[PDB]
Write an enzyme that holds these catalytic residues in place. Structure first.
Site, PDB file in Angstrom:
ATOM      1  N   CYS A  28       0.802  -1.200   0.000  1.00 50.73           N
ATOM      2  CA  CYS A  28       0.000   0.000   0.000  1.00 50.73           C
ATOM      3  C   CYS A  28       0.853   1.275   0.000  1.00 50.73           C
ATOM      4  CB  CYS A  28      -0.956   0.013   1.202  1.00 50.73           C
ATOM      5  SG  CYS A  28      -0.180   0.464   2.784  1.00 50.73           S
ATOM      6  N   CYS A  51       4.795   1.265   3.840  1.00 52.16           N
ATOM      7  CA  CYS A  51       6.139   0.950   4.333  1.00 52.16           C
ATOM      8  C   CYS A  51       7.157   1.955   3.802  1.00 52.16           C
ATOM      9  CB  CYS A  51       6.478  -0.518   4.040  1.00 52.16           C
ATOM     10  SG  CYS A  51       5.443  -1.725   4.989  1.00 52.16           S
ATOM     11  N   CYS A  82       2.982  -7.568   5.191  1.00 58.09           N
ATOM     12  CA  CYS A  82       2.607  -8.223   3.939  1.00 58.09           C
ATOM     13  C   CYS A  82       3.777  -9.013   3.375  1.00 58.09           C
ATOM     14  CB  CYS A  82       2.181  -7.174   2.904  1.00 58.09           C
ATOM     15  SG  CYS A  82       0.705  -6.245   3.265  1.00 58.09           S
ATOM     16  N   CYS A  85       2.565  -2.985  10.279  1.00 61.83           N
ATOM     17  CA  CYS A  85       1.634  -2.567   9.237  1.00 61.83           C
ATOM     18  C   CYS A  85       1.179  -1.151   9.551  1.00 61.83           C
ATOM     19  CB  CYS A  85       0.443  -3.527   9.159  1.00 61.83           C
ATOM     20  SG  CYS A  85      -0.576  -3.316   7.673  1.00 61.83           S
ATOM     21  N   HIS A 140       2.788  -6.201  26.115  1.00 56.89           N
ATOM     22  CA  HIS A 140       2.004  -6.237  27.345  1.00 56.89           C
ATOM     23  C   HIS A 140       2.893  -6.292  28.578  1.00 56.89           C
ATOM     24  CE1 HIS A 140      -1.177  -7.730  30.019  1.00 56.89           C
ATOM     25  NE2 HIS A 140      -0.333  -8.682  30.376  1.00 56.89           N
ATOM     26  N   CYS A 151       3.908  -2.811  29.308  1.00 54.94           N
ATOM     27  CA  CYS A 151       2.872  -1.799  29.097  1.00 54.94           C
ATOM     28  C   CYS A 151       2.617  -0.997  30.361  1.00 54.94           C
ATOM     29  CB  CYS A 151       1.567  -2.468  28.655  1.00 54.94           C
ATOM     30  SG  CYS A 151       0.207  -1.324  28.438  1.00 54.94           S
ATOM     31  N   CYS A 202      -7.003  -0.660  31.704  1.00 49.95           N
ATOM     32  CA  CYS A 202      -6.449  -1.495  30.646  1.00 49.95           C
ATOM     33  C   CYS A 202      -7.419  -1.584  29.481  1.00 49.95           C
ATOM     34  CB  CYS A 202      -6.156  -2.888  31.225  1.00 49.95           C
ATOM     35  SG  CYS A 202      -5.782  -4.202  30.057  1.00 49.95           S
ATOM     36  N   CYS A 212      -7.432  -4.945  22.968  1.00 49.28           N
ATOM     37  CA  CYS A 212      -5.973  -4.820  22.897  1.00 49.28           C
ATOM     38  C   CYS A 212      -5.321  -6.192  22.741  1.00 49.28           C
ATOM     39  CB  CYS A 212      -5.430  -4.166  24.164  1.00 49.28           C
ATOM     40  SG  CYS A 212      -3.666  -3.806  24.022  1.00 49.28           S
ATOM     41  N   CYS A 243       6.944  -0.634  20.740  1.00 46.23           N
ATOM     42  CA  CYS A 243       6.126   0.577  20.692  1.00 46.23           C
ATOM     43  C   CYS A 243       5.924   1.253  22.033  1.00 46.23           C
ATOM     44  CB  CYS A 243       4.760   0.190  20.060  1.00 46.23           C
ATOM     45  SG  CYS A 243       5.008  -0.604  18.478  1.00 46.23           S
ATOM     46  N   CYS A 272      -0.297   3.239  19.856  1.00 43.85           N
ATOM     47  CA  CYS A 272      -1.618   2.650  19.658  1.00 43.85           C
ATOM     48  C   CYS A 272      -2.326   2.342  20.966  1.00 43.85           C
ATOM     49  CB  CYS A 272      -1.491   1.364  18.830  1.00 43.85           C
ATOM     50  SG  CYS A 272      -0.540   1.623  17.330  1.00 43.85           S
ATOM     51  N   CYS A 315      -3.774  -1.882  20.760  1.00 48.70           N
ATOM     52  CA  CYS A 315      -2.849  -2.580  19.862  1.00 48.70           C
ATOM     53  C   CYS A 315      -3.621  -3.616  19.055  1.00 48.70           C
ATOM     54  CB  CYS A 315      -1.749  -3.267  20.670  1.00 48.70           C
ATOM     55  SG  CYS A 315      -0.557  -4.282  19.741  1.00 48.70           S
ATOM     56  N   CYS A 339      -0.018  -5.703  14.863  1.00 51.37           N
ATOM     57  CA  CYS A 339       0.278  -5.556  13.449  1.00 51.37           C
ATOM     58  C   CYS A 339       1.598  -6.192  13.031  1.00 51.37           C
ATOM     59  CB  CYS A 339       0.241  -4.067  13.066  1.00 51.37           C
ATOM     60  SG  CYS A 339       1.607  -3.055  13.582  1.00 51.37           S
TER      61      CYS A 339
HETATM   62  S1  SF4 Z   1      -3.549  -2.107  27.560  1.00 52.31           S
HETATM   63 FE1  SF4 Z   1      -3.041  -3.981  26.246  1.00 52.31          FE
HETATM   64  S2  SF4 Z   1      -0.784  -4.322  26.439  1.00 52.31           S
HETATM   65 FE2  SF4 Z   1      -1.451  -2.862  28.136  1.00 52.31          FE
HETATM   66  S3  SF4 Z   1      -1.840  -4.150  30.024  1.00 52.31           S
HETATM   67 FE3  SF4 Z   1      -3.854  -3.945  28.921  1.00 52.31          FE
HETATM   68  S4  SF4 Z   1      -3.953  -5.732  27.428  1.00 52.31           S
HETATM   69 FE4  SF4 Z   1      -1.770  -5.513  28.128  1.00 52.31          FE
HETATM   70  S1  SF4 Z   2      -0.671  -2.229  16.530  1.00 56.82           S
HETATM   71 FE1  SF4 Z   2       0.616  -2.873  18.371  1.00 56.82          FE
HETATM   72  S2  SF4 Z   2       2.553  -3.713  17.404  1.00 56.82           S
HETATM   73 FE2  SF4 Z   2       1.504  -2.479  15.760  1.00 56.82          FE
HETATM   74  S3  SF4 Z   2       2.411  -0.360  15.951  1.00 56.82           S
HETATM   75 FE3  SF4 Z   2       0.574  -0.377  17.269  1.00 56.82          FE
HETATM   76  S4  SF4 Z   2       1.316  -0.908  19.392  1.00 56.82           S
HETATM   77 FE4  SF4 Z   2       2.942  -1.451  17.914  1.00 56.82          FE
END
Ligand code: SF4
Ligand code: SF4
Ligand code: FCO
Ligand code: FE2
Ligand code: NI
Ligand code: H2S
Ligand code: H2S
Lengths: 277, 482
Positions: free
Chosen positions: A12, A15, A115, A153, A202, A205, A226, A232, A241, A253, A259, A262
């Site tokens: 797309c 990248c 991809c 992605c 996670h 996180c 959360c 997520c 990230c 994200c 999240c 990706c």
């Molecule tokens: S927001 Fe997502 S990565 Fe963070 S503690 Fe909750 S499930 Fe885990």
């Molecule tokens: S979707 Fe998850 S792995 Fe992909 S850029 Fe966002 S936080 Fe990072």
């Protein structure tokens, strides 16, 4: 500055765009100081068969020494006709043809984006083009050139640039053969460099305490709880990230939404539905 | 001189995979065919999924304009789900998407188009190129072009920081969902957005808009070619209230010198010259079908051929600025006088011939970038820090919805039909689909195909104006085919 060819299959252009967002080194510094980007359809000066023949002239001179970046999946159905990337001397060139031509002669192939790395959205349920990941296509066709996967992605620019720099630094320490072996050593079982993909989202996180306590947000805009109940996929995702964040560190994200996993080989189907657990 | 067929594949400095084939006779293009050569099939991939997943999946149509697809998708879902987007979420969406208009236009002019007129540094990817590239700028103006290209790499990156402030990341935002926007703007992040916006605005007003007119004044012949059908479509974009009736760009069709309303039921997609099953031809998007037929005789593209009441129309900045006819920017008006001797106040004062031209499409895109500055400034004053931006609607069992917006390259619509709480059908009719499509079932050319007719090719060994014309339309073949 080593020569790089950037071929787009079923991509797309995300990248490529993410790479343009590199902060340090800037993309200007990457292009003028780090690599010699000899072929890239989105940005290069020349066009058409002249651009293809320029890539072929460089590839002939630098056989075994150029780096091949692939963005997008490689579709094998219909004799490759779902991705035609050029024409030279009235012969169409499919993505299948191009990977069989240049793949054997690259120092290494960098499969950029989910991809190229794993098939991604073009390979997902409901598709019908035979979208194939780079490493699988090369292996199926007996091409042994080393592949490094840089998924996402899109990927973060730092993952792309950082992997290029890691490979180039490794080659200057140990030569071409030795350096490529060092690179292999820092790849996980999904072919991803561990500097960027070796840690779980996670486990690192900032909302982990809320997950462990069972405190879940019920609306996206509640930033205290959360995000697990909102969908997520951090528990299943290996990327950095949480630390690097995105777009100059301004967001990421999980802070903004959820999240979607990706960077993972099962994206999107094994990470979907995105907005439930 | 005689007759020459020239094939260009890949057309570079566009997004995606395009082949252009032209016939040249006596120094001018007399026929053209455009081929979108890559297919993914999002419309079949999306079937069977949780409809909320669409606003993530569809962005992967294109990493240059993902926010446009996100927007069309969430608007379609909002309708299907019956979700009432909070006022502050409407404004937050506009801030996410508007920032990518700035990014996309700046990327297009400098990083895709400018090398058509500017010689870059003596290193890849700026060399090699055609021996006679028709690069006319003085040493000093060429250097200004290169310096601005380099500076623009930073400016477009800052635009993506703006997108990500409330969108999460870019490409492929996380922050737009059915029901609004996932992150309430805070005072502190609005300061961050505004500070970046100030830098972008200054670059647009001080460098970008002036350089387009200034380069244009050295290529005045490029205002005399590329007219094509001189017919344009706008479907409307950027809701300015919560009633759905006032937009920054208002909808309309222009054809044969006449303005008329836009009625989406008049859209049909033809496939005679496209690699799709013959039985799917001529469908409106609400009954659209996507059945690839890559071996079908006579076809030459994966782009379908959309027609509006049988008309082949173009989309994009020129279309929107022509249809809406705003005042030209103060600097544009000044430079039109200083450098072209043209007195103009409204956009249409350029006249149809110069507006619908190769260089006129670049001018339109620069003027639209300026126009977007005022819109974003307005949204930054209108937004309320801390006010909720999302509702959490349930997935409906059975529903339909359509989202209409204007992507940077032109009109975009997504249609979704939900059955048994899953996507039953999803159809996309995108901007470069309107521009870069092949002939329809009646043999009528697509907009860019028609605009290529008459393009000068005085040197068949250096046929630079073929792709110069194509690039003026800012093609995105990922969008066109999906
Ligand atoms: S927001 Fe997502 S990565 Fe963070 S503690 Fe909750 S499930 Fe885990
Ligand atoms: S979707 Fe998850 S792995 Fe992909 S850029 Fe966002 S936080 Fe990072
Ligand atoms: N802008 C953009 Fe993408 C295209 N063409 C869409 O819609
Ligand atoms: Fe479509
Ligand atoms: Ni696009
Ligand atoms: S695009
Ligand atoms: S966009």
């Amino acid at each position: 500055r080593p020569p790089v060819f950037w071929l787009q299959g079923q991509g797309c252009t995300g990248c490529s765009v993410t790479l343009l967002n590199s902060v340090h080194p800037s993309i200007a510094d990457v292009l003028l100081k780090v690599i010699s980007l000899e072929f890239h359809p989105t940005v290069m000066a020349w066009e058409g068969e002249h651009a293809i023949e320029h890539m072929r002239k460089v590839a002939e001179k630098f056989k075994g020494k150029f780096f091949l970046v692939i963005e997008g999946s490689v579709p094998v159905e219909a004799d490759g006709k779902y991705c035609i990337i050029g024409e030279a001397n009235h012969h169409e060139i499919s993505m299948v043809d191009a990977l069989k031509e240049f793949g054997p002669n690259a120092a290494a192939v960098l499969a950029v984006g989910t991809c190229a790395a794993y098939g991604g959205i073009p390979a997902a349920e409901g598709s019908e083009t035979g979208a194939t990941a780079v490493s699988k296509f090369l292996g199926d066709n007996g091409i042994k050139t080393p592949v490094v996967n840089i998924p996402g992605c899109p990927p973060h620019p730092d993952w792309i640039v950082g992997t290029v720099v890691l490979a180039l630094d490794a080659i200057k320490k140990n030569g071409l053969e030795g350096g490529l072996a060092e690179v292999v050593k820092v790849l996980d079982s999904d072919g991803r460099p561990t500097p960027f993909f070796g840690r779980n989202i996670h486990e690192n996180c900032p909302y982990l305490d809320k997950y462990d306590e069972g405190v879940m947000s019920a609306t996206f805009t509640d930033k205290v709880g959360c995000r697990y109940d909102l969908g997520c996929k951090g528990p299943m995702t290996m990327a950095d990230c949480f630390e690097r964040k995105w777009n100059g560190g301004v967001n990421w994200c999980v802070q903004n939404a959820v999240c979607i996993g990706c960077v993972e080989p099962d994206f999107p189907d094994g990470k979907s539905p995105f907005y439930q657990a | 001189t005689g007759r020459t067929t020239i094939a260009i594949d890949p057309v570079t400095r566009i997004e995606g995979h395009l082949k252009a084939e032209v016939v040249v006779e006596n120094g001018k293009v007399v026929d053209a065919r455009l081929s979108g050569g890559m297919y993914r099939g999002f419309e079949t991939i999306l079937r069977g999924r949780d409809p909320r997943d669409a606003s993530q999946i569809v962005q992967r149509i294109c990493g240059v304009c993902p926010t446009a697809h996100s927007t069309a998708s969430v608007l379609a879902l909002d309708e299907a789900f019956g979700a009432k987007v909070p006022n502050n979420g409407r404004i937050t969406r506009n801030l996410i998407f508007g920032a990518n208009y700035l990014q996309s236009h700046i990327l297009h002019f400098y990083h895709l188009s400018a090398q058509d007129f500017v010689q870059g540094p003596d290193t890849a990817p700026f060399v090699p190129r055609f021996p006679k590239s028709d690069l006319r700028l003085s040493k000093e103006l060429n250097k200004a072009g290169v310096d601005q290209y380099i500076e623009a790499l930073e400016v477009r990156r800052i635009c993506h920081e703006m997108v990500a402030l409330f969108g999460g990341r870019m490409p492929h935002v996380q922050g737009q969902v059915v029901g609004g926007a996932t992150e309430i703007p805070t005072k502190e992040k609005l300061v961050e957005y505004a500070a970046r916006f100030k830098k972008v605005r200054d670059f647009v007003e001080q460098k970008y808009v002036p350089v387009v007119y200034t380069i244009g004044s050295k290529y005045k012949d490029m205002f005399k070619v590329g007219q094509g059908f001189k017919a344009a479509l706008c479907v409307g974009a950027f809701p300015l209230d919560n009633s759905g009736k006032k937009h920054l760009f208002m909808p309309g069709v222009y054809a044969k010198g006449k303005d008329m309303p836009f009625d989406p039921s008049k859209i049909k997609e033809y496939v005679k010259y496209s690699w799709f099953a013959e039985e799917t031809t001529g469908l409106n998007y609400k009954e659209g079908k996507t059945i690839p037929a890559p071996d079908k005789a006579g076809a030459y593209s994966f782009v379908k051929a959309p027609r509006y009441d049988g008309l082949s129309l173009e989309v994009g900045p020129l279309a929107r600025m022509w249809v809406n006819n705003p005042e030209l920017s103060p600097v544009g008006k000044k430079l039109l006088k200083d450098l072209f001797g043209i007195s103009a106040k409204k956009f249409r004062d350029l006249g149809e011939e110069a507006a619908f031209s190769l260089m006129g499409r670049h001018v339109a895109r620069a003027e639209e970038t300026y126009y977007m500055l005022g819109a974003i400034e307005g949204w930054l004053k209108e937004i309320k820090a801390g006010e909720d931006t999302v509702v959490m609607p349930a997935v409906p069992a059975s529903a339909e919805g359509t989202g209409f917006t204007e992507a940077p390259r032109g009109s975009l619509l997504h249609y979704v039909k939900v059955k048994d709480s899953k996507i039953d059908n999803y159809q996309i009719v995108s901007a470069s689909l309107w521009n870069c499509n092949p002939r329809d079932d009646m043999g009528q050319r697509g907009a860019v195909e028609e605009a290529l007719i008459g393009i000068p090719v005085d040197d068949i060994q250096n046929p630079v104006n073929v792709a110069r014309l194509i690039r003026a339309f800012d093609p995105x073949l990922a969008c066109a085919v999906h």
